[PDB]
UniProtKB/Swiss-Prot annotation, chain B:
Essential for the formation of pili. Involved in the biogenesis of type 4 fimbriae probably by serving as a 'porthole' allowing passage of the fimbrae through the outer membrane. It is found in: Cell outer membrane. This is Fimbrial assembly protein PilQ. It comes from the Bacteria. Belongs to the bacterial secretin family. PilQ subfamily. It comes from Pseudomonas aeruginosa (strain ATCC 15692 / DSM 22644 / CIP 104116 / JCM 14847 / LMG 12228 / 1C / PRS 101 / PAO1). The lineage of its organism: Bacteria, Pseudomonadati, Pseudomonadota, Gammaproteobacteria, Pseudomonadales.
Amino acid sequence: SGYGKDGNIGIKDEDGMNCGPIAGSCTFPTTGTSKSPSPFVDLGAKDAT
Amino acid sequence: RLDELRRIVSQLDIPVRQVMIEARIVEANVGYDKSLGVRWGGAYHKGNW
C-alpha cells in the first residue's frame, strides 16, 4: 500500500469479490478469477484523486 | 468699571459662528476572479485525472 496517496488493491480485490467475480486460489502458485467488475468502478472512485 | 464691563459685554455678545462640515466616505471594490477546473476521466481503461 502507498502512503502519500495510499493504495492497497488487495482490499480492493475484496471489494470486487463483494461485486461478484469468481476467485479461486488453492496454493500460492495456483489462482484464477473471472467476472471481475471491480477495476472499472473501484479503481475509478478510489483513484479519483 | 461699569463702562469697562460694558465693553467686555460688547465683545462677549458676539454671534457664535456655525460651520457646515461635510465629510464623505468613498468605498470602491473591484473584484476579478477566474477559476478553471480541467478534468479527464475514463473508467474504461481506468485512466482518470
